[PDB]
Amino acid sequence: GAMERVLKVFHYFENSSEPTTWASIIRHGDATDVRGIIQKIVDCHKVKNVACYGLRLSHLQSEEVHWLHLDMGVSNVREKFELAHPPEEWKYELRIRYLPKGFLNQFTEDKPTLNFFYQQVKNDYMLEIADQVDQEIALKLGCLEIRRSYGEMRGNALEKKSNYEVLEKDVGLRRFFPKSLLDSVKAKTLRKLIQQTFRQFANLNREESILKFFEILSPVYRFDKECFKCALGSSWIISVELAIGPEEGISYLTDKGANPTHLADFNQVQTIQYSNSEDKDRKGMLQLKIAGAPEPLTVTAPSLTIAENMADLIDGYCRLVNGATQSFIIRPQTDDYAEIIDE
């Protein structure tokens, strides 16, 4: 018998449990597209900035990731990739990928989205640099999350050892601070540090804690831009590193450390077009037609996978910046219903 199509999609909409376990089980049809899955999940959480969310497919046993375009079919993608690796090795994750200029101010008017982005960046921070950052930053971020998780608790409740005790023994400080910090500092000293650091933020509400978290994290962790190693040029190919994000639209890094050089703004992108490889090679080519520029911006990526992930990013930004729901990618020169059946 023809089994029913069911999909598990992790996300960052806070539930009663651990961040990495939050996920939605979706029952869908044969013609359901990535767009419908995204829309159903965000609409269920009353999200306003729907054009910021994308769906990322990660291989658990490696680092290869595939951003899924809004127009692709859910059954199609699962078909294609299950051929490469078994379903158990795949992870579908809903994430915010396209940020509008002044996204933080804008997200404050969309609480569900502000919290989502916060959980997403927090989780990336905890996994990528929590153990590398300096004690001070890690300590403040950990306290900010304590302040945010317990918005009903009084400012000096942490002063009581009995209360600190519960977090230290029952909840566990790993929920707010990195391992390095919890194992490189004396337990009794750690407590005083936390108590003191918390005082600075005891007056902050949930929103103000999130905003302060970003303010403090921003300086040492770039979460507002994606970077890709590729090459620009039609005739002459020059390898560079592209920095794509709200602040500097599409730009490139001259050299590690130096400010990125602007190439084009998202609103100037008129068309995005794919290309394969005229020879044995497998590189992927992206051609961007920019308003005001007679010559298209040609980009070459190390593989088709990266090329597609880049096209998805630029297209998402094109949709976002223009307020369009349709794709700017052009051809190379009931039954789709989806429902949440569990959380």
Curated annotation (Swiss-Prot):
MF term (GO), any: protease binding
GO CC terms, sorted: cell cortex; centrosome; ciliary basal body; cytoplasm; focal adhesion; nucleus; perinuclear region of cytoplasm; plasma membrane
Q: Where is the FERM domain?
A: 5-325
GO biological process terms held by the UniProt record: actin filament organization; angiogenesis involved in wound healing; epidermal growth factor receptor signaling pathway; negative regulation of anoikis; negative regulation of cell-substrate adhesion; negative regulation of protein autophosphorylation; positive regulation of cell migration; positive regulation of cell population proliferation
Source domain of life: Eukaryota
**Principal location class:** other
Q: Where in the cell is it found?
A: Cell junction, Focal adhesion; Cell membrane; Cytoplasm, Perinuclear region; Cytoplasm, Cell cortex
Tell me yes or no: is Iron among this UniProt entry's keywords. no
Could you tell me which residues carry Phosphotyrosine? Y337
PTM summary from the entry reads: Phosphorylated on tyrosine residues upon activation, e.g. upon integrin signaling. Tyr-337 is the major autophosphorylation site, but other kinases can also phosphorylate this residue. Isoform 2 is phosphorylated on serine or threonine residues, but apparently not on tyrosine residues.
**Keyword check for Phosphoprotein:** yes
Keywords of this entry: Angiogenesis, ATP-binding, Cell junction, Cell membrane, Cell projection, Cytoplasm, Cytoskeleton, Developmental protein, Kinase, Membrane, Nucleotide-binding, Nucleus, Phosphoprotein, Transferase, Tyrosine-protein kinase
Function of the molecule: Non-receptor protein-tyrosine kinase that plays an essential role in regulating cell migration, adhesion, spreading, reorganization of the actin cytoskeleton, formation and disassembly of focal adhesions and cell protrusions, cell cycle progression, cell proliferation and apoptosis. Required for early embryonic development, embryonic angiogenesis, normal cardiomyocyte migration and proliferation, and normal heart development. Regulates axon growth and neuronal cell migration, axon branching and synapse formation; required for normal development of the nervous system.
What family is this protein classified in?
Answer: Belongs to the protein kinase superfamily. Tyr protein kinase family. FAK subfamily.
Q: What is known of its domains?
A: The C-terminal region is the site of focal adhesion targeting (FAT) sequence which mediates the localization of FAK1 to focal adhesions.
Q: How does it assemble?
A: Interacts with ARHGAP26, GRB7, DCC, PIK3R1, PXN and SRC. Interacts with the ARP2/3 complex.
Protein name, UniProt field: Focal adhesion kinase 1
Species, as recorded: Gallus gallus (Chicken)
State the gene name recorded for this protein.
PTK2
